[PDB]
Amino acid sequence: ATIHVDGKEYEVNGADNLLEACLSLGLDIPYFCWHPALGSVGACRQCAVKQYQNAEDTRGRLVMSCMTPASDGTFISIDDEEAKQFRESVVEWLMTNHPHDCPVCEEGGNCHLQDMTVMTGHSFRRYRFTKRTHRNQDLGPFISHEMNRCIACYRCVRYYKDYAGGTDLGVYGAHDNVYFGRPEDGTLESEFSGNLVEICPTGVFTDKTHSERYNRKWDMQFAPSICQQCSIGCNISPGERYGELRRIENRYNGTVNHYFLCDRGRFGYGYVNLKDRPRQPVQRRGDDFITLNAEQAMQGAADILRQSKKVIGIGSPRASVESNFALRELVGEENFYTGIAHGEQERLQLALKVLREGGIYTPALREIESYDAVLVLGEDVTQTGARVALAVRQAVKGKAREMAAAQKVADWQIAAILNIGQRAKHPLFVTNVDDTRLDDIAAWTYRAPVEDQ
Amino acid sequence: PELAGIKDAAPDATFRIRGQKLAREPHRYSGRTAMRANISVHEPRQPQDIDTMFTFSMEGNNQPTAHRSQVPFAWAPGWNSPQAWNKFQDEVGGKLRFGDPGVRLFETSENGLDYFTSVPARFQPQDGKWRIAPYYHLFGSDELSQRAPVFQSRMPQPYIKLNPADAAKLGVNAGTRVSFSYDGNTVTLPVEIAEGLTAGQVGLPMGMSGIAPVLAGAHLEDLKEA
Amino acid sequence: MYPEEPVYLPPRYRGRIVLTRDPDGEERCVACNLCAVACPVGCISLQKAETKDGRWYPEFFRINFSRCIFCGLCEEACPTTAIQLTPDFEMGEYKRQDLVYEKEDLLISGPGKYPEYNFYRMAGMAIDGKDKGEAENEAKPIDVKSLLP
Amino acid sequence: EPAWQTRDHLDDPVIGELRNRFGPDAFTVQATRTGVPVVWIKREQLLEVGDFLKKLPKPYVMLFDLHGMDERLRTHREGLPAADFSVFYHLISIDRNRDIMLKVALAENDLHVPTFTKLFPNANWYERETWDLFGITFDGHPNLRRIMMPQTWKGHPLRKDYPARATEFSPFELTKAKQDLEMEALTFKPEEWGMKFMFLNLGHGAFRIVLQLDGEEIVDCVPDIGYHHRGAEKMGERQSWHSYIPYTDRIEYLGGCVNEMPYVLAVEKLAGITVPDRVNVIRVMLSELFRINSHLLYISTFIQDFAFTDRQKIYDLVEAITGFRMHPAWFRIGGVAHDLPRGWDRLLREFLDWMPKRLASYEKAALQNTILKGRSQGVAAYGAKEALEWGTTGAGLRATGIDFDVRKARPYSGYENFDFEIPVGGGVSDCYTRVMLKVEELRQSLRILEQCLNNMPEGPFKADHPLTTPPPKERTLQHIETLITHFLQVSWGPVMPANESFQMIEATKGINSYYLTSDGSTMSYRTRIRTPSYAHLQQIPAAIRGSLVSDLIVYLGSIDFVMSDVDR
Amino acid sequence: MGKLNDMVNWGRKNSIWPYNFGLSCCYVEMVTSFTAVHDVAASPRQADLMVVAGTCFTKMAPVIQRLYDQMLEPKWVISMGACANSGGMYDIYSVVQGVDKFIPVDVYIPGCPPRPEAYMQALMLLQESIGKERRPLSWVYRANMQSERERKRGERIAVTNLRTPDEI
Ligand code: SF4
Ligand code: SF4
Ligand code: SF4
Ligand code: SF4
Ligand code: SF4
Ligand code: SF4
Ligand code: FES
């Protein structure tokens, strides 16, 4: 397509809405309720631009860029004065009831609301009345709840319910006493509830494990890493401070795990911070445990290994490729053993032979969401490969997406898609020894022994 | 040779973005002359990273328009939240700009396998032998995750799953602790009634305290009330 | 005339840095790390801890005074008025390690230059003695189960 | 129309003259917030453009600045030629009261520019420093050596891929440097330094000059500078826009708020901030107090070659206002840090009732001391021709009869509202003429302070702009929007949208200027600081030729330079 | 014997000639220290105290090292300001991070710059350090003095109210 933003011509995809098209080009439009993975609902009214009917139009009309298609020959203005004033007004309206909490808020320096308050250029408070308050809930060990900071943008419920398929987080109440959370105090039951700490643009849902040993984002030392907790390989950004691993943030990978982790990967990093970890080489001498440095340990181990007639190596599927290879080089190829059982290795080798010799394309984790029918045999995915279960949920919602696409409804207009696709879904057939967490969306569930499956 | 694709998973340690390395920490990293001041007032050396292309300082490159795939964190001026990932992608919600990191080791084969003709028989429950049905838990079946102290409050208590018919045959109710011997080790767990489990199977939480994942599909002997 | 006649210092003189207390007597620092990041020299290091009531405070707080330039940017950064620069200059030492002032060397027993400001009287977060709706310009929380329309 | 607006300066007659001379496709005009026309010139046409601008009807006579820039990391290069590096030449015409910035683009491997020392002799040290900090070779340069670094230095520190931080200290390098410096007096090579008779080393600041003497006559002298190089510009790339103000203070340390002023005015040009009138008056008042302090120190030092109580009065007044004596760090982006304390006017009134008698005493100590008149007049003098070609500004330039002061020619910070005169010399820059000009400047600064005291605006000390850093403190302490703005401004930094700004002010030693390039971030992409002491120290080998060493000492005492201002 | 060492240390502490080798703003503060409004009252060969007051650059460091080596025992060193203590605000490529990287320092002064009364306080501290230690009488065991931080802790923590910055 062709759009004209502030007198400049850009080529954008016509299937996109105006907000994501302009954000792709590098234009800054404030937004709260829109998310790339969740679609457009037009709640927060923050993404306002001025759309003109043609080139020689002067009045224009304030539209929401997330709800407006990026059609061919579309004339808009982002930096128009009326659009800027409306966006600043929306920020001010969000600020009327917002608590004075930024120093004692875990999202400070990481807050989308802070960034959009600064970006709209709103810094002068002329509201003088009382701010509405709220009582918090206990959401369990992982997610801290602070409902005062909510801007009522519906990202949490849209993610947790429409995307993640959870059932225990909704919106309750009315006019401006809208409340987001569980119907009662209790742990959030989703396996993907931890993505709320990044879906929520404020400090309502925060990482409680990060909150117990807290530091700001500018103080973190980050690195790109791979989650070590299961086999899916979601990209993570672990951040440390003062020598201890403080937080696991999601690291975007458009091929694998785009915006979302699972709760095991996000909250199961605390083994790195244990105080019983080995920190120096330790050699036993009778009942004593002498601490060595690096070179003494290497010389002593080399002497004893040189005296021994045959040294064998036992690797692990926890260790990296380089470490298993280094052990294999140390002990020899014939003396290297994968440190897993024979039946486990047989199943792993058969899975490998199927993947790289079966002639059938094995999809990436994001590519799973584009399949029209899913048969899951034996694998309780939600407890072993949880991100695949989330991707399977998206692939199941693909039927509602297809039905809405038949009626010329845009793919980002998610509310109309869910309205058209009421309960129709693509087929899902799961088999397990018992009930899975995918049974709420499965077309059929087969509870049977592994022989019967 | 099968692992030859790990060379292209990331660039080597000599990779630079216009001469400079990639930063591990943001530009506004603070406390650089007081974070170790309790140990010694003299600042130590910055840790040298010779293994990789990243640096252990902010003296590096983390621009969104930098020709790299490995991004340590998303930050752009004006965008401090996780919405800063919008600047690091070619289009928002799509691929990472200049490609996603990671390479597939193997391509799809030209020809497939043959049909596996080894069809197993129907499962038959025999007396005194209990087939272990694996129940995995997201919080508790991965070893290092179990070691994390925040998962102790989140993981369930280890319940052994029984069919209503099998528990009625044993006389066991929901909650009474039963003992079973595996590898000459009698261990006791409280019973949870599993309706969807089939008779002759016993459900066990794989990976948890004392129950190894190797036990999945193994038989069980001498399952009595404790 | 020194140290015979004490030298007059103006009230906003940028000398020795202290941490102050609120009028209630509790330390004002909520350990928000704004002073540490606003320091152009990086000579402030602290760590947030949190009591049972949910009150943020610094677990430790240290300033390397061999490195401080007494520019007062940390006091300008402080949203609680906890960190202040006093009119005091006699801070000479024998060992450079003894110029690293920990939290007990900094935390005075009073409010300092700002005698009435209490951040937790304005913050929305609930602590002991201050529930929800008890801050300044706050209404009591209205439950969603309430009978009013 | 705002003074910070992004202008193209296509209505400048110099642009039309360049179009008529070299053609419309020979150069690229860049729209900046510098307030000068920025013209990208091809590298081959650089000497032709310099010749053309030197021979205009009202010519561009002074090379104000010349420095490099690493463009490899700059992401917002819209409307700019493809450059890995660039070299900018800031040229000033005083007859037109205008200036132009010529930028030459360079590829990464072909880093060599024709030398500019044939047109402007003061380009020698600038090209040496551009080679030293960027590795840009200048073809035809006589002795292109390092001026801020030792000769055994690897890499060029202002390149973007150079580590800013201090590396690990080694006693071995210290012993090697001791062996190198302490064998210089024994194994001196009189061809590296540009010379070609005894060789002496001397050893405002501590610095070394290599002197070549015929008996006691100075036949050649080469200063060795860089002993006080603090890397302030590289720190400009490392600090945020707000947390760099102390570093601006610590350059020309006798200036203080005077040194803060051009930095904050350039940042406010980047931010689009028009400060209110009380902010302008406060910053003028503090800059004039510090100007009086610096002039008092300079006069007292020259008279030495009683006056330290008035400096204490000024320091007490600045202590009351800011909280600190000589590094106040008090100007902010969009205002000043605090309001004036209640009682400042009494202190200023007691200061202005004390200074006329002291000023009369200084005029009696400088005029009636005819020994000083005999030993100061004709001591390393120069005319307007030598002042223009060496970039001499401030008291020397005005002592050569050229009436060019920034506070009147290109007014800033509301200096238009104040009635004050510009003392102009007779046409010869003696030591005595410069000292008399400093005395008359001190009188005019006292007049400015009287006009500040009698007519003081009652209003805000910070602007009502969203990029005012930090916001007013009481609204920060009780408003959430203001708290958010304070949180993001003091932590990540204020975001200046991508532009280039320039501010030139009259410092206490001459003309000081900041040239800031923002890449749309919270830090500076490039910070260039032009200080007058650099150009004043370059002029010593052009004026002390054939004179005595005592004349060199008196001339050094009468230059009014500080070494931290030289080595910035 | 006991009184003799006391009188020797008394003579050393009551007569101290500083070689104020300053390099920057701190040196100019020490120039202002010599005036009659502060009342603070050579060559490195006969000077017994070296006051390093300013930034120790990588090029000025050999000069400082040589000028310290030219001094003679007993010799004492006072660092003035943040630059001489630690490098100060210049954690930059061209600055040695503290003068105690290459010469021993006996008394440190925080500040940027310290005021001259802080220099007089450091002179008092150095005099007490000299008077408490003891050296061989004819041809070195320095006393481990209590730090000023913990000594002054009670009267510093006991401070409650300060004058507000609004007034003068
Ligand atoms: S949610 Fe954001 S704006 Fe609200 S208190 Fe927290 S950091 Fe401040
Ligand atoms: S809790 Fe967070 S995600 Fe949910 S509506 Fe409120 S601000 Fe949006
Ligand atoms: S699905 Fe969960 S445990 Fe597995 S790699 Fe991803 S975040 Fe880690
Ligand atoms: S006064 Fe300046 S240098 Fe000292 S701790 Fe505060 S911000 Fe840092
Ligand atoms: S800015 Fe103030 S409240 Fe925040 S960490 Fe520093 S002293 Fe504590
Ligand atoms: S400590 Fe401060 S005042 Fe002293 S030399 Fe360094 S920058 Fe100058
Ligand atoms: S982002 Fe468009 S209305 Fe919310």
The reply to whether omega before C3 is within 30° of 0 (cis) is yes
Cα–Cα dist D32/D26, whole Å: 19
Q: Pull the structure tokens for residue D207.
A: 């610095």
Cα–Cα dist D520/E158, whole Å: 48
Stretch (H or E) spanning D59: none
Q: Pull the structure tokens for residue B80.
A: 């401090």
**Range(s) of the domain holding residue D464:** 232-567
Residue type, A340: I
Strands D511-518 and D499-506: antiparallel
* Closest CA of chain B from E137, distance in Å: 35
Q: Do B41 and C96 touch (CB under 8 A)?
A: yes
Chain C residues near residue A179 by CB distance under 8 angstroms: 144
List chains touching C (3+ CB pairs under 8 A). A, B, D, E
Domains of chain E (ranges; CATH) run 1-158 (3.40.50.12280)
Contact present, B144 and A245 (Cβ < 8 Å)? no
Q: Which are the contacts of A62, defined by CB distance < 8 A and separation ≥ 6?
A: A48, A49, A50, A51, A82, A83, A86
CA D149 to chain centre: 20
Contact present, D432 and D377 (Cβ < 8 Å)? yes
- Cross-strand pairs, A50: A62, A77
Ligand 4, residue C35: give the atom nearest the CA. Answer: 7
Nearest to A194 by CA among A211, A177, A172, A173: A211
Strands (E), B62-215: 130-135, 160-162, 177-181, 186-193, 201-205
Residues with CB under 6 A from ligand 7: A 19, 31-34, 42-47, 64, 66
Last residue of a domain, one of D105, D139, D173: D139
Other beta carbons less than 10 A from residue D223's beta carbon: 19
Closest CB to D323 among C12, C37, C136: C12
Chain B residues near residue E86 by CB distance under 8 angstroms: 33, 41
Contact present, B100 and A255 (Cβ < 8 Å)? yes
Other beta carbons less than 10 A from residue C4's beta carbon: 6
Same domain, D246 and D370: yes
Chain D residues near residue E112 by CB distance under 8 angstroms: 327
Contact present, C32 and C120 (Cβ < 8 Å)? no
Pocket test of ligand 3: the residue of A193, A236, A247, A262 to mutate, having most ligand atoms within 8 Å of its CB, is A262
Last residue of a domain, one of D88, D107, D139: D139
Q: Output DSSP code: residue B150.
A: G
Resolution of the experimentally solved model in angstroms: 3.1
Q: Do B88 and A252 touch (CB under 8 A)?
A: yes
Task: Find the ligand nearest to B139 CA.
Answer: 3
Cα–Cα dist D21/E34, whole Å: 62
CA A10 to chain centre: 30
Distance A346 CA to ligand 6 centre (A): 71
Whether D152 is covered by a domain: the verdict is: no
* Closest CA of chain A from C15, distance in Å: 25
Strands (E), D57-115: 62-70, 85-93, 98-106, 112-114
Same domain, D126 and D250: no
Fold annotation for B129-225: Barwin-like endoglucanases (2.40.40)
CATH number at residue D398: 1.10.645.10
User: Which residues of chain B are at the C interface, by a Cβ-Cβ cutoff of 8 Å?
Assistant: 28, 30-35, 37-38, 40-42
| A-interface mutation test, from D467, D475, D477, D481, most A Cβ less than 10 A away | D481
Contact present, E118 and C92 (Cβ < 8 Å)? yes
Last residue of a domain, one of D139, D161, D180: D139
Task: Find the ligand nearest to A205 CA.
Answer: 2
- Cross-strand pairs, A374: A428
Stretch (H or E) spanning C17: strand C17-19
| D-interface mutation test, from A96, A123, A148, most D Cβ less than 10 A away | A123
* Closest CA of chain A from D494, distance in Å: 9
User: Which position has the token pair 């203590």?
Assistant: E85
Q: Which are the contacts of C122, defined by CB distance < 8 A and separation ≥ 6?
A: A100, C135, C136, D477, D478
- Cross-strand pairs, D516: D501, D527
Distance D399 CA to ligand 5 centre (A): 52
CATH number at residue D40: 3.30.460.80
Same domain, D396 and D524: yes
- Cross-strand pairs, D218: D213
**By what technique were these coordinates determined?**
cryo-EM
Q: Output DSSP code: residue D28.
A: E
Contact present, D230 and E90 (Cβ < 8 Å)? yes
Residues with CB under 6 A from ligand 5: A 103; C 29-35, 46, 77-78, 80, 82-83
Domain count within chain D: 2
Pocket test of ligand 5: the residue of C45, C78, C85 to mutate, having most ligand atoms within 8 Å of its CB, is C78
Chain C residues near residue B30 by CB distance under 8 angstroms: 33, 36-37, 39, 42, 44-45
Q: Pull the structure tokens for residue C53.
A: 């009531």
Pocket test of ligand 3: the residue of A197, A230, A251, A383 to mutate, having most ligand atoms within 8 Å of its CB, is A230
State the SS3 of chain A.
CEEEECCEEEECCCCCEHHHHHHHHCCCCCCCCCECCCEECCCCCCCEEEEECCCCCCCCEEEECCCCECCCCEEEECCCHHHHHHHHHHHHHHHCCCCCCHHHCCCCCCCHHHHHHHHCCCCCCCCCCCECCCCCCCCCCCEEECHHHCCCCCHHHHHHHHHCCCCCCEEECCCCCCEEECCCCCCCCCCCHHHHHHHCCCCCEEEHHHHHCECCHHHCEECCEECCCCCCCCEEEEEEECCEEEEEEECCCCCCCCCCCCHHHHHCCHHHHCCCCCCCCEEEECCEEEECCHHHHHHHHHHHHHHCCCCCEECCCCCCHHHHHHHHHHHCCCCEECCCCHHHHHHHHHHHHHHHHCCCCCCCCCHHHHCCCEEEECCCHHHHCHHHHHHHHHHHHHHHHHHHHHCCCCCCEHHHHHHHCCCCCCCEEEEECCCCCCCCCCCEEEECCCCCC
* Closest CA of chain B from C100, distance in Å: 7
Chain E residues near residue D339 by CB distance under 8 angstroms: 166
What SS3 class is residue D147?
A: coil
**CA–CA distances in Å: residue D148 to residues A8, A436, D179, D207:** 46, 71, 20, 12
Q: CA B10, B16, B20: angle at the middle one, nearest 5? A: 135
Start-to-end CA distance of chain D, whole Å, equals 35
Q: Mind giving me the DSSP string for E53-92?
A: ES--BTTTHHHHHHHHHTS-SS-EEEEEHHHHHH-TT--S
| C-interface mutation test, from D234, D331, D474, D490, most C Cβ less than 10 A away | D490
Same domain, D238 and D134: no
Contact A/E (≥3 CB pairs under 8 Å) = no
Closest CB to C42 among B33, B40, B41: B33
